């Protein structure tokens, strides 16, 4: 299932100038989907044109005050679907799929039950069906990690496309008064914007990324349009020390964890094959620490040019030379690296 970059619109705790002017600035890093939201006709109309020359998926949160299944007002606009923040019983949301304006019907992925179950029990067209997360504007009241999963698990089962929110940090309009940052999961409120969108990516359960507050910085954009979407990629910083050869084993691979782990580090070693031939001289060997990057050297025999990752504390092993570390934000990322898992290593 393809991944997409989206971004988040308030038009009216803003202008149709700047909000046209975003949207412009987004497409530029490969972002193709918009959320947008109607708290309180012609300049949404304009807005949701300018999105779709610019190739960008519209879906409408409108709040249900504001106005019953003639959703042909959502169609005049140009929206491309529409979100239910709230369900209903089941049947209701089964019979919006089967809508003759082509609309999509989002579904918030944040209620843990069997939601869908009840929807496709009657006679629904589930390809009309996607998915998305809540976001929270309260400090402490986002998703628990385990929750989240359950969740996007369920969609993720139905073969049902989700998305959820993470937070910018220049980013200041919201939908309402309070905003602590608009993301989904409560541990991405203070992660840094690439990070967030790399640890939704990496559960292998989250396929559309969308900034939830706006706007965020044009630096923020490219950060996010550079990734890829994928794999994995691990910030690296290097030892003063590390060697060229050193840097083009970390850098130039693409690395597997070999599928027999151990919980101690992930051994990268396919890449010794390429490296064996090359000199490692010993070097000050130090503790090793989890998010090291490490490299068996000369001394090390058979398990010379052997690249690894220390996910555990062991002792000093003169055995390896230190070549750099994951970047400290990024070290819960190591998790993802499962059993016959590629991922890079990036500065």
Same mark, same amino acid.
């Given at each position: 299932?393809?991944?997409? +970059?989206? =971004?988040?619109? $308030? ?38 044109? *300018?999105?779709?020359?610019?190739? %960008? ?38 019979? %919006? /799929? ?6 999509? =019907? ?6 843990? &039950?069997?939601?869908?179950?009840? =929807?496709?029990? @009657? ?6 069906? &996607?998915?998305? *997360? ?6 402490? /009241?986002?998703?628990?990690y385990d929750y989240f999963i ?7 089962? @139905? ?28 541990? *991405?409120?203070? +992660?840094?914007? #690439? ?14 990324? &969308? =900034?939830?507050?706006? $706007?965020?910085? #044009? ?11 994928? %794999?994995?990629?691990?910030?690296? *910083? ?11 084993? /970390?850098?130039? #691979? ?10 101690? %580090?992930?051994?990268?070693? #396919?890449?010794?094959?390429?490296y064996k031939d090359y000199d490692?001289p010993v070097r000050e060997s130090? +503790? ?14 058979? $398990? ?31 998790? $993802? ?6 991922? /890079?290593?990036?500065?």
């Amino acid at each position: 299932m393809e991944r997409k +970059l989206g =971004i988040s619109l $308030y038009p009216e705790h803003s202008t149709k100038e700047k909000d046209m002017a975003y949207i412009s600035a987004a497409a530029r890093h490969g972002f193709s989907r918009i959320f947008t939201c109607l708290l309180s006709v012609a300049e949404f109309k304009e807005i949701i044109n *300018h999105a779709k020359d610019n190739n %960008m998926e519209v879906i409408l949160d409108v709040a249900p005050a504001v106005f019953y299944s003639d959703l042909s007002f959502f169609a005049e606009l140009g929206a491309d679907g529409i979100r239910l923040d709230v369900g209903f019983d089941g049947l209701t949301e089964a019979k %919006m /799929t089967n809508n003759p304006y082509g609309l999509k =019907i989002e579904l918030n992925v944040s209620n843990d &039950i069997a939601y869908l179950e009840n =929807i496709l029990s @009657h006679q629904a067209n589930k390809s009309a069906l &996607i998915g998305c *997360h809540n976001f929270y504007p309260q400090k402490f /009241t986002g998703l628990p990690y385990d929750y989240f999963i359950r969740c996007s698990e369920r969609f993720k089962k @139905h073969g049902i496309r989700s998305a959820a929110f993470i937070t910018s940090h220049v980013a200041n309009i919201g939908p309402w008064d309070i905003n602590d940052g608009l993301c989904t999961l409560e541990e *991405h409120r203070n +992660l840094p914007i #690439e990070v967030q969108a790399k640890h939704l990516w990496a559960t292998g359960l989250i396929d559309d990324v &969308i =900034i939830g507050n706006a $706007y965020a910085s #044009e630096e923020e954009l490219e950060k996010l349009g550079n990734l890829n979407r994928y %794999m994995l990629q691990l910030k690296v *910083h290097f030892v003063d020390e590390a060697t060229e050869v050193e840097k083009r084993a /970390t850098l130039q #691979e693409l690395h597997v964890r070999r599928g027999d782990i151990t919980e101690y %580090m992930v051994r990268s070693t #396919e890449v010794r094959k390429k490296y064996k031939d090359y000199d490692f001289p010993v070097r000050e060997s130090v +503790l090793q620490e989890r998010g090291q990057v490490v490299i068996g050297n000369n001394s090390f025999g058979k $398990y010379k040019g052997e690249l690894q990752i220390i996910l555990k504390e062991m002792p000093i092993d003169e055995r390896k030379n230190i070549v750099g570390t994951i970047a400290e934000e990024e070290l819960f990322l190591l998790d $993802y690296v499962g059993a016959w898992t590629q991922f /890079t290593c990036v500065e």
